[PDB]
Amino acid sequence: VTLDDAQIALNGIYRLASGHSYYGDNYWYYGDCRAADVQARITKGDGKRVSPYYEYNVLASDNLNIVLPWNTVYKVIRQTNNLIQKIESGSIQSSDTKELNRIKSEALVMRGLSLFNLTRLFGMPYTNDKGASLGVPIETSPSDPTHKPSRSTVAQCYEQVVSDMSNALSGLRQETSNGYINYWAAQALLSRVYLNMGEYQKAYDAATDVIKNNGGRYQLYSYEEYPNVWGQDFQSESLFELYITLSEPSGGTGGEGAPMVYANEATVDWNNLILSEDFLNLLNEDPKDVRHCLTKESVIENNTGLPAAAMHEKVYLAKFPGKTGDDPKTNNICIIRLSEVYLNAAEAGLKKGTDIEEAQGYLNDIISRRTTDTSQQVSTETFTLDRILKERRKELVGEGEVFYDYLRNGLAIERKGSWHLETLKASNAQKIEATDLRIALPIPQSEIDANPNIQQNPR
């Protein structure tokens, strides 16, 4: 009915996105445990946390890992469609066009982000085949529940993502907006989207808009600051971050939330994410790297809940310790931050083959703020893709993106570290090519059973 009712609906969409089965957990840690740096601690079998993703053996029947993540993101999409339609139908009793348009624009970005998230889990990487293969169903109007849609292609899905985020931009806030999507967040997310389409110039344009034009609203963390920002709400790099307390969601991000699944607990309980030897070896290539501050040994000495080779290693990631430093369930959920935007620009620049010096500068903006060893900075000769991808692994560990770094670059993922789980042998997941059929998660069996127009991903 009222403008405030519309805002409350939008707040509900953000709350759902922060919840279990969306960014609370599955969409947070998927892009880490599928790569080589963050592994399961222990195998738990089908329907349990982390391991079915990590082992590349998750089934269409998996409620925790397939049914819930699919259905939850579609619920968000449906809510965005209902809200957008309510606004457009003229049946909100408000003359405040600017605010109605802002709410609509934020809903549009959330709709696009949601479709992107589904597409990248359940579809083969766009860059394998210009998105020719199957993506997911596209909904842009309230659900026709008589209607059984079909999966659109990955490219059709990306077109809709790009449209939604782009069409949103002029209605979004220019000012900083803690907890919500503004113009800067949307352009940052577009840089991620375009990069994973191999649309390097468009990625570069979006990322550099944020870098050059944000107006001092956002700042890269200094070396001195870096250890202290983690767990603190809305720090200077954060472009879009969902607000969490123990009151909303009730219980914060809960036991299943990524922060608890990474937790370094006094009694082993919820944890199922630890750093691999691949990651520690990479970070140890530079002993002056400030990011060593985020790797911690088990607080339980002589912990028999770890693989024996990891017992005393610094395999706990401390990025999400909570607002007071000892309750991870209170940690906010940063969706995208400025370091990723600089890295996206660096990668897009190198790949497109122009603006090279500027692009190299953006890589060095990260390197120079993360180490005191000046020789780590790149020249044109040492500005290579591998060097960028190494920096991304160091910078963005735990933030849900590293998997896609391999996929969009056609790179095989190898789990070489000595404490990777033995289940990777039985599941044939020590090496995953970017063309491996198992990269595309199975469509939920609930969909297959219900809708004969929905094809399953091959195996």
Binding site for Zn(2+), by residue number, is 147, 159, 297, 301, 312, 357, 365, 373, 375
Q: Is 147 in the site for Zn ion (CB under 5 A)?
A: yes
Instruction: Record the tokens describing residue 69, joined without a space.
Output: 């993540």
Distances from the Cα of 183 to the Cα of 63, 81, 97, 118, 390, angstroms: 35, 20, 18, 23, 29
Q: Report how far residue 335's alpha carbon sits from residue 252's, in angstroms, rounded to the nearest whole number.
A: 16
Task: Determine which helix (DSSP H) or strand (DSSP E) holds 100, and give its type and residue range.
Answer: helix 97-122
Query: Residue 38: phi, psi to the nearest 5?
Result: -120, 125
Q: Which of residues 54-93 bind Zn ion (CB under 5 A)?
A: none
Using the rule CB under 5 A, is 141 a contact of Zn ion?
A: no
Using CB under 5 A as the criterion, what x/- string covers residues 174-213 for binding Zn ion?
Answer: ----------------------------------------
Sole window of 68-76, 148-156, 162-170, 432-440 interacting with Zn ion (rule: CB under 5 A):
148-156
Question: Is 373 an interacting residue with respect to Zn ion (CB under 5 A)?
Answer: yes
Contact 182, 174 (CB under 8 A): yes
Spatial neighbors of 253 by CB under 8 A, at least 6 apart, are: 18, 20, 24, 25, 244, 259, 260, 328, 329, 331, 333
Output the smallest distance, CB 160 to Zn ion, in A: 8
Annotated binding site: 147, 159, 297, 301, 312, 357, 365, 373, 375
- Residue 130 binds Zn ion (CB under 5 A): no
**CB-wise, 159 or 256, nearer to Zn ion?**
159
- 256 contributes a contact to Zn ion by CB under 5 A: no
Name which of 94 and 163 has its Cβ closer to Zn ion.
Answer: 163
Residue showing the smallest CB distance to Zn ion in the complex? 375
Q: Are 73 and 114 in contact (CB under 8 A)?
A: yes
> Candidates 53-61, 253-261, 294-302, 406-414 — which segment interacts with Zn ion by CB under 5 A?
294-302
Residue 55 vs 286, nearer CB to Zn ion: 286
The helix/strand count (H/E) of the chain reads as 16, 8
For residue 295, the SS3 value is: strand
List 38's β-bridge partners, or say none.
275
Rounded CA gap, 256 and 23, in Å?
Answer: 11
Query: From the CB of 45, what's the least distance to Zn ion, in Å?
Result: 29
| Interacting positions 374-403 with Zn ion (CB under 5 A) | 375
Interacting residues with Zn ion between 92 and 111 (CB under 5 A): none
Say how far apart CA 197 and CA 190 lie, in whole Å. 10
Query: Which string of x and - marks every residue 339-368 that binds Zn ion (by CB under 5 A)?
Result: --------------------------x---
Q: How far is the CB of 216 from Zn ion (least distance, A)?
A: 14
Beta strands in 323-430 (DSSP E): 333-337, 413-414
Using CB under 5 A as the binding rule, whether residue 285 contacts Zn ion is answered as: no
Residues near Zn ion (CB under 5 A): 147, 156, 159, 301, 312, 365, 373, 375
